[PDB]
Ligand binder design. Structure first.
Ligand SMILES: NC(=O)c1ccc[n+]([C@@H]2O[C@H](COP(=O)([O-])OP(=O)(O)OC[C@H]3O[C@@H](n4cnc5c(N)ncnc54)[C@H](O)[C@@H]3O)[C@@H](O)[C@H]2O)c1
Ligand SMILES: NC(=O)c1ccc[n+]([C@@H]2O[C@H](COP(=O)([O-])OP(=O)(O)OC[C@H]3O[C@@H](n4cnc5c(N)ncnc54)[C@H](O)[C@@H]3O)[C@@H](O)[C@H]2O)c1
Ligand SMILES: NC(=O)c1ccc[n+]([C@@H]2O[C@H](COP(=O)([O-])OP(=O)(O)OC[C@H]3O[C@@H](n4cnc5c(N)ncnc54)[C@H](O)[C@@H]3O)[C@@H](O)[C@H]2O)c1
Ligand SMILES: NC(=O)c1ccc[n+]([C@@H]2O[C@H](COP(=O)([O-])OP(=O)(O)OC[C@H]3O[C@@H](n4cnc5c(N)ncnc54)[C@H](O)[C@@H]3O)[C@@H](O)[C@H]2O)c1
Lengths: 333, 333, 334, 334
């Protein structure tokens, strides 16, 4: 299980922290043209949210290798995927976490290097989409390039599946309150694709567009077309919270809904879905590695068919775990 | 129209800025035991959100009077409402904006001074509740003490009334993303009444409880029991956004909903309800004095009976305007 | 008379424009920014996170070409390359270079090829002469093809440093600045090849950052050249900074006397440039303050009467943008 | 042996407790806070915005009375008045006074009435002697009924100031601190009768704030007494501060030599107290760092070899809370 990372960013570095820590996978190659080999060293070591790394990893040679205890990782800086030699240093698995190559077409440039699989660290217009714990088994050794969906979809689908599996969802609207990301700006700046997105990120509540509810349909067909949503970017560095307003087919009191989710959190969905009854706020989930954590005391019901459910997620650390879990599930057909 | 302010806080100072600016009202008395006469001078002058004041106002005498151009305001520091002599210096109208005296019973201590009316700057368990533009006409010269509802209710009811007036609301769930307030804490501290509320305010998304949807019923009886909601406190100094997920009786496309609201914003509800199609984020509404501003591009519809609507509000400045408008409407039966 | 052009419609670009538009003695001719659509330009100008909505005007007419500011029409350019900018072809005699990427004297010169008579660089340069208004803008000479309005920080420091120097003389001085974030920073830990700490998430760190401001003062105030050095920390505020000045003086003084001295100069030659407050100010109190430097009497502290620390506030965006307009005006007369 | 009591379960209260609980050489006996319910105490201890969830333990048993920390049981008090605190009745030999409201030597003494042998004030005092670990904790003498662990800032400054002083001697020095917000500040502009700027909304202002840290150094380091003075700015970060030191030295030096000197002392007597980094650090890099002062070589700047500026990082909450525990331990031995 040799893993390469394309784009050593929030997700890429975090995914590296996760990979290097597990004993069943190994980190073979990193690519990022914008970060020099040594600089990678600094970026990996220090982190504003996740803390200084607690094991070890340094620069061995002028530009080609880092040393983690005793495992070499080679370092590339290649602007173009097709010109990444994942082959010439092993790494059957590639995490595509640049944000520019989500088109299955564009991520395939990785097959041209020596790479058996590609995992895109975002939703794709056109790549099978899997969310661990909900539809990862729909996977096949014959799918070359795949997607781990998005952090929001990963938080939503697990709650969504359980909710519909047992009470059925007539209709659903989701709102997420979400932390800022690399695509935002420190001060009002240009972002042609999304205008509300150039506004100074830590000083505004910025409405923002999210395709996750339309994505839950595409990993969970019973719900296809039955949910949609929007988002608000707000000024926290990390952690987000999903807010789902749903209409239930079968009448259910709040307490019933509560321990139906508690059960799955203990059962099939342990490690993916969590459940809490504490008075948590978002810093409480920094470093939490579940996909979704249901917040019982938070949610609210109008009537036993109409209800609002709140679930947390650490958009960076949770989603990064799931990437590794997909990859491992991949290698075991 | 002589107005006194109890508790020279965010709302009280802002309401003072609003009163002093209008020509149809006058600011007679301010009470606040925790702020000395001169200090009031400093607090009124400078403001982190609203800017330095643009007309003028200074300390005349050791502890009893401030001078605004040529109008004296007397300054009290009395811990107990019943012992405030609103009489002995005029001021028929009192804005109760301390946050400790929302009980109609407790606000009545103001009638014991020389005061014809009291306006509570918050919801009351037991005081008639009015939201300008929605039910201010249900008022009577015989109601002694009143409530201007809450900032969220003031943002919600105007959208709510229009929505139900024309398409009918079967069921509604509201979420607000809301700025932090004086009740929150800079760092994790004690708040026995609400635990998620002691967590460091500018570093968390903090779920929080709101009675506004249950309050919209109590100024708009058609909707009584047909909406509820929750809130998220987030790290912006001012401005909040209401997010309403509603189920409509009569089918309506999004565009229809849009210009049905546009119309009222131009019509009956001008100055209370606004409408925009721009890419606004919350700083865009700092200083906006409407009750509610509908954000068209933001909202979303699943189906023509199920829809999500987004409206902004400047929790401090909008609500403070409305207080003055209630008071003025009061004095004119 | 006095038509102006702006290259780089960013924070300084748009703001210098809110200024040029509010004055009578100056006109806004055209703007260039290859990264902002003509309609986007109206959105960005109109709404501002720090300085509020713009309250006079203001729309566009030409599919891509022209913006109507009230009734004045501004020509809109989306052109990468500076010499490809036909400034004159839309009579733009003065060009504000607020791009951040052409602070070189030869670099800025590309604007002249375009048919343009002067280029003011809204940022310090390695070569272009540096003038700070109220300190040495008289060295301007009509020959200077290209100029620099130096930095926000140098504008807060210099005015202040002069009064202190020209009344008690500065022997030795060290400068710290507590500065707001800027567009060069990152929302989230990200790549900053030229400055590593500067890649760290901006609104959640106190970030040591470099500044030349204390040495630039020597270049605009050759009296002081070589006697000042400093550093900065970027911190999570959207706008407004503060200068922290540690100086030793030849001429003994008290805090009261240095306080009185500053007030004097404040209404003298340096009115509107150097300000003086004795209130309990905090940084939001200075948002939209057009003065280059505001001295804060109650904040500072003294060790001796020769060893002292001096506090000056400044709105890095608005004071500086005002100053650019000022300096241009003075170059039009002289 | 070494049982400890905490008055004021706040930021310093709860954190000194995460410390006392992690060590073997010390026990946590009981806590007092009239404003926190016994069950609330577990919530507040458990979850923390800056330092994460606590990862060893930990529950309660007694309706109101007792908390189980792993298997150690802690007695919970909700009592306003210090002398009403029967500390001994629950064998608590050492009392950490982290309330903020009893920093007076006679004020702290109320704890002794309660049957308690020593009171460490987690904050500087007007009277109580001030010891800074690694600088002068040896002046402790077994007679001292009551002690002060001084301030977070004095702990960052003193260690550093000594190395500089005892190798090149400080003639004259001025200190600035860029400091994180604390519980004394306000989310929103609100009343601060004792300090007006300190009432201003904390996460949206750079706030000038006062500090005695440079003068407290003289009281713990009488070599330096009267040669340092300073100020601070509070800024929108939740934890971690940085010290800005402007000093002139009798003994000429280079930046390299002062750099080498600090490193030396860093592993010498002052290991674990004074730290030394040459990396590209920012303030989050120091969250949960238990050292009292971390010197930052790349940040600082030098004017002469007698005029220099020195940068030290510090986690005001965690370093200080570690230090309190340290000083108590040293008082148990000596
Ligand atoms: N941050 C989150 O909460 C989060 C969560 C889920 C999914 N994602 C997804 O992950 C992807 C990256 O997100 P991020 O938050 O890490 O952003 P990021 O900006 O920190 O990472 C981008 C990285 O890619 C590198 N890069 C850019 N072009 C490259 C190229 N052609 N070759 C190699 N490297 C290149 C950059 O230097 C940078 O380090 C996006 O697709 C994003 O939607 C992010
Ligand atoms: N800030 C908002 O967005 C907002 C919006 C709508 C309603 N309100 C309501 O307004 C009220 C106050 O809100 P705020 O945000 O201005 O808070 P705030 O803390 O700034 O104001 C409270 C003020 O009351 C003074 N005070 C306390 N006790 C007093 C007493 N007994 N006599 C006289 N003065 C006393 C205080 O010194 C303080 O100045 C609350 O009821 C709140 O729910 C606030
Ligand atoms: N923001 C401040 O506090 C401030 C203060 C004083 C000085 N300055 C200086 O001002 C300059 C710009 O600063 P800013 O803060 O406005 O930066 P900014 O990023 O906000 O603005 C730069 C603008 O330049 C545009 N741009 C980039 N490349 C261009 C090109 N080839 N042609 C035309 N436009 C281009 C960008 O689209 C952007 O709109 C820098 O040199 C900086 O040192 C900034
Ligand atoms: N937070 C810091 O960075 C820090 C660092 C160094 C020193 N200090 C010092 O520590 C002291 C406390 O600081 P803090 O930051 O933890 O403050 P804090 O407000 O967070 O904690 C004070 C605690 O004292 C409790 N309390 C108040 N009155 C009490 C009483 N009568 N009896 C028992 N408990 C009472 C409060 O409930 C609160 O839990 C102050 O003296 C401060 O100078 C704080």
């Amino acid at each position: 299980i040799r893993i390469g990372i394309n784009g050593f960013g929030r997700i890429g570095r975090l995914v590296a922290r996760v990979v290097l820590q597990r004993d069943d996978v190994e980190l073979v190659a990193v690519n990022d043209p914008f970060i020099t080999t040594e600089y990678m060293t600094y970026m990996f070591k220090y982190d504003s949210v996740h803390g200084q790394w607690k094991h070890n990893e340094l620069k061995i040679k002028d530009e080609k290798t880092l040393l983690f205890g005793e495992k070499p990782v080679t370092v590339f800086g290649i602007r173009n995927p097709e010109d990444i030699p994942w082959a010439e240093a092993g790494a059957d698995y590639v995490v595509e976490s640049t944000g520019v190559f989500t088109d299955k077409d564009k991520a395939a440039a990785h097959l041209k290097g020596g790479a058996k699989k590609v995992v895109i660290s975002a939703p794709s217009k056109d790549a099978p989409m899997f969310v661990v714990g909900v539809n990862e088994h729909e996977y096949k050794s014959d799918l070359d390039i795949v997607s781990n969906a998005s952090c929001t979809t990963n938080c939503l689908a697990p709650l969504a599946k359980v909710i519909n599996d047992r009470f059925g969802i007539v209709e659903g609207l989701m709102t997420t309150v979400h932390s800022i990301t690399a695509t935002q700006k420190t001060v009002d700046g240009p972002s042609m694709k999304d205008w509300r997105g150039g506004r100074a990120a830590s000083f505004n509540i910025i409405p923002s567009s999210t395709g996750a509810a339309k994505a839950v349909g595409k990993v969970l067909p019973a719900l296809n077309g039955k949910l949609t949503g929007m988002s608000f970017r707000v000024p926290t560095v990390d952690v987000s919270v999903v807010d789902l307003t749903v209409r239930l087919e079968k009448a259910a009191t709040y307490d019933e809904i509560k321990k139906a989710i508690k059960e799955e959190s203990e059962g099939k969905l342990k490690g993916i879905l969590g459940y809490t009854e504490d008075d948590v706020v978002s810093t409480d989930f920094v470093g939490d590695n579940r996909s979704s954590i249901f917040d019982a005391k938070a949610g609210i019901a109008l009537s036993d068919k109409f209800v609002k459910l709140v679930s947390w997620y650490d958009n960076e650390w949770g989603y990064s775990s799931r990437v590794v879990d997909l990859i491992v599930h991949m290698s075991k057909a």
